Every structure is written in structure tokens, then in C-alpha cells.
Amino acid sequence: ASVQIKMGTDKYAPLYEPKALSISAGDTVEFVMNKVGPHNVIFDKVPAGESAPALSNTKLAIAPGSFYSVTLGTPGTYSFYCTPHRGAGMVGTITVE
Ligand SMILES: [Cu+]
């Protein structure tokens, strides 16, 4: 089902929430900015099927509200991270079963 990726916790902690995310081939994964911005989508790498090193948008959306959404299909576990909040420990995952 349609899911969303929140960047930042109510604990002023810059982390991807939910830390883990699962979906099916054909589902969508939204992305909104919680706090401790800015943020952005900087995937780590995905298995054959998709293009992790492509979807990565360096369009640091300063304006808080809701970055954008994107649909997937390629089955497997996708990994990403926050370009800025890289050391802060802001990484997550996305499954497309
Ligand atoms: Cu972040």
C-alpha cells in the first residue's frame, strides 16, 4: 500500500522514519520532511531492476511540507541515506515484495 518516508523524528532527531519500509512491486513511497532539515533523497544502491543511483534527488527541499512521491516495481530491498544527516545516522530501507 501507499507509504511515506518521514525525515526526522519528534525528538529533533534527523532520521528516516519509518527506519524500515516494506511495499510491493507497483506500490509508492512518499517522502515528507519532519524537521532538522533540510533533507533530500540520496539512495545508497539497489539490485538489478531499479536505478537507486538515479532517483537520488539533490534538490534539498528547504520548504518543509512534503518533498515528493515515487512509484517502484523492481523487487528487492532498497537502501538510502541523508546526504547531510549522514553522520547523524539517518538511513532507512525500502522493500518491494
Ligand atoms: Cu535528513
Curated annotation (Swiss-Prot):
The keyword Lyase does not apply. Residues 1-97 form the Plastocyanin-like domain. The keyword Isomerase does not apply. Participates in electron transfer between P700 and the cytochrome b6-f complex in photosystem I. It is a peripheral membrane protein. One of its GO terms (cellular component) is plasma membrane-derived thylakoid membrane. Keywords: Copper, Electron transport, Membrane, Metal-binding, Signal, Thylakoid, Transport. Cu cation binds at H39, C82, H85, M90. Its cofactor is Cu(2+). One of its GO terms (molecular function) is copper ion binding. This is Plastocyanin. The gene is petE. Belongs to the plastocyanin family. Its main location: membrane.
